[PDB]
């Protein structure tokens, strides 16, 4: 986790 | 001054309007007013108006109680709404007691009361520069919202581009002829998400600018058949809306969080006032967090801050510091939600801050290492303490801290405290479709 | 004066007057008239009209009555919705009996009967200032009322906003243009809930002002696709409406309830009123609330009052006195609804008051300590009664009392009974659908 | 009970 | 009897 916003493109 | 009363009569009297409307703010910060017809400008001017001051309680309201309804010449503003025969205009208005003394239980005269006490200290000025963040979600033919967010846009992108939509750009537009100073706008992270920032300004100028911009971008996103929401985190697994708030302090005149020959290029004066921030960071957190919904966007993963830490350079800190210097020398404080009351909001952070300068508190050591990584008992050792995980947890922890509890007087302390209260049970003892569908089954 | 009889025919010569209606009230509020046409206005002028007098009694009529219609010039207004070829004015008309003797039938011609009697007692005016509030429903296709309100809004909220809509702002404007005076409005606590407030005039303009009032806001709100009902409670669990009266006396020109050197700055006048207002107000009940829906508005936990007591500051106090003193001092009883006939309302209101005064009786203590929380038992010990429970009960406290007969007279009274009488009759017989949900499948 | 209209928001 | 349209209100 620890980003999920920025790679929630994918 | 920028309007006088001669200039308000003759402005009325050229633009013909024939509905004023006297407006204020309650504790849950949802904006009201009481109406006068323009012959009744003149008792409006005069401080005549009386109304139901137990309003401003909201739904814990008791008994009728009669204020009046001092307005402020300087927040004049003509909608650009024409209804029908004549033009409406507004005021923002002060509530006071029927013997002269202002209302305590007014948010706006409590903030006023809190920069009272900061001018006490010696400072002149209490600068506040918003970034405040919302989704915008289609209406259905019903002309209700629904969950399809505008555009699949990402950060800082051209995503709405030319060829009409750009609802932002409108709503930028439109601001700026009503007379609003918008510094930037751009496409925030997550889809059908949107920020537009306005320049600084002061605390009280600044949360009146907040109010009317929720009132206008909502206006102008109905025009555009969408549907334009400040709720802090409206879907799961997407980022949230934050209203960073970027606090700077002047003194005679010139910034006093700025000093060229200090480390960070920071004065004693603003490490002081983190030191304060940091100090009761988890205290005011239930007023600049209020909603039970505003702790879900307190997660971790989406840029949200979620400890108590200060940095210039980290992953979602609590408080950061801006490159720039010199006169624009600021504190950001991120927590804050759309959603909280701005005067509350402000008032106990100045409070804070205040309170830091006054007892010539410590600032802590700044994050630069990703306490992310690092387990919360790895970092409980260190100085970092977790931000409230409910509304219930930040309300327990607010009743405790003494000097939180003046930052907004009795009255709004004992008001907020059980209408958050009735909120928080209210949640507690409902039964959500997520336990349906993971329990009916299941069990 | 305002008008005179050559302003009169001046006035519908240039504005082109084709129909006259001669408008009064009957014993149930609702609006009444006989219609003439233009060339009948030199005849309606000399006090010549005649009609059938009966039809004041309402349903409760057995015989054809010959009356005048001795019209009021002050009242003459103009319609704004033109009626295609020529206009519309009206006249609100006093009820003579064919002798010249005023009509003792008439509930206007009542009014002025009781103020002719507190004339006789050395005071000057006697001013009403009402707050009348309503419901907003929603018209189908077959343009009839439903039960879906016009908004969900709340207490003093900016619900209705811009953009269209807000038939409260419509109405308040469109009043304005037609000579009446509004003091201010507001959304009320229940969703598409209501408020407009009129400056306090003299008690026959008062009523009058109530009934174009009433008839005003119903056409508007056709006008817009509504329904306006002024119903005391339409809906179950939901906040009624009232028609709080503000009552002021006056001698000599001169505010006579206020005295500056007196405890909570109040005359001995408005004490020996208050006692008055106190010693009937179980009498005049039937009066001020005469429907059936009146007493499920009367009910606790709604702001509604359903105790016999007067305070300054009280959740829900049957007598309140507002804040304001000096010329502005009034005496607030809020057990009317907008259901009741204004000027039998005035009238009993009137005589409960001048009884009063005339023995110079004395005030209870006023009660600051929440009545509600104690039981009827623990506050029976008190001078705090229990107001009627159903209009059955307040018509049998009415009858018994001596002095609220004379309030309205004889004719009056024993038409009212009837009435009255028929309607709770009529009602009791029912069998609700309330009943056949609970007791068809139990039993 | 004591508050039932303003509290029907809930 | 005796009064049948004056109270067909009802
Ligand atoms: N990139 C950003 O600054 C977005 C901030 C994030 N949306 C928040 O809620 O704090
Ligand atoms: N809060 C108010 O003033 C509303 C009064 C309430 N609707 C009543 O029926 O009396
Ligand atoms: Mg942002
Ligand atoms: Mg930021
Ligand atoms: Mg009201
Ligand atoms: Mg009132």
Redesign the pocket.
């Known amino acids: 986790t620890f980003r999920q916003?920025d790679m929630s493109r994918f | 001054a920028k309007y006088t009363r001669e200039d308000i009569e003759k402005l009325v009297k050229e633009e013909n309007v024939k509905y004023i409307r006297l407006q204020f703010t309650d504790i849950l910060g949802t904006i009201k007013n009481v109406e006068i017809p323009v012959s009744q400008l003149g008792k409006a001017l005069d401080n005549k108006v009386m109304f139901d001051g137990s309003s401003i309680e909201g739904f814990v309201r008791i008994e009728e109680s009669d204020m009046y309804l001092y307005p402020d010449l300087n927040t004049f503003v003509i909608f650009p709404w024409t209804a029908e025969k004549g033009k409406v205009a507004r005021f923002i208005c002060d509530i006071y007691n029927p013997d002269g003394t202002p209302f305590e239980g007014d948010p706006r005269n409590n903030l006023k009361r809190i920069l009272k006490e900061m001018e006490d200290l010696g400072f002149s000025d209490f600068n506040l520069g918003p970034?405040p963040?919302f989704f915008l979600f289609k209406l259905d033919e019903k002309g209700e919202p629904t969950l399809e967010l505008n555009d699949k846009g990402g950060?800082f992108d051209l995503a709405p581009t030319d060829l009409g939509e750009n609802c932002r750009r409108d709503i930028v537009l439109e601001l700026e002829e009503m007379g609003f100073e918008i510094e930037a706008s751009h496409h925030?992270?997550?889809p059908g998400?949107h920020?537009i920032d306005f320049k600084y300004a002061g605390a009280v100028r600044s949360c009146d600018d907040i109010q009317t911009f929720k009132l206008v971008v909502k206006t102008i996103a109905r025009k555009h058949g969408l549907h334009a929401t400040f709720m802090?985190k409206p879907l799961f697994g997407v980022?949230?809306?934050?209203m960073?708030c970027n606090l700077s302090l002047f003194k005679n005149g010139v910034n006093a969080f700025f000093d060229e020959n200090a480390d960070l290029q920071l004065s004693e004066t603003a490490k002081h006032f983190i030191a304060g921030i940091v100090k009761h960071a988890t205290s005011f957190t239930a007023v600049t967090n209020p909603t039970v919904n505003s702790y879900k966007?307190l997660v971790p993963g989406?840029?949200?801050?979620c400890y108590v830490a200060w940095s210039a350079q980290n992953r979602?800190p609590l408080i950061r510091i801006p490159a720039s210097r010199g006169i624009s020398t600021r504190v950001e404080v991120?927590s804050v939600?759309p959603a909280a009351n701005p005067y509350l909001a402000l008032s106990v952070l100045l409070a804070a801050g205040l309170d830091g300068i006054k007892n010539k508190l410590e600032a802590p050591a700044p994050i630069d290492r990703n306490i992310y990584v690092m387990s919360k008992e790895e970092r409980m050792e260190n100085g970092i303490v977790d931000l409230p995980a409910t509304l219930a947890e930040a309300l327990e922890e607010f009743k405790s801290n003494e000097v939180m509890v003046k930052a907004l007087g009795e009255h709004l302390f004992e008001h907020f405290i059980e209408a958050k209260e009735i909120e928080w049970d209210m949640f507690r003892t409902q039964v959500h479709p997520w336990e349906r569908e993971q329990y009916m089954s299941q069990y």
Chains 1, 4, 5 share one sequence.
Do not use: L
């Open positions: 916003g | 970034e963040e950060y925030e992270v997550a998400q920020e802090p980022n949230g809306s934050g960073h966007r989406y840029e949200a801050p979602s991120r939600d």
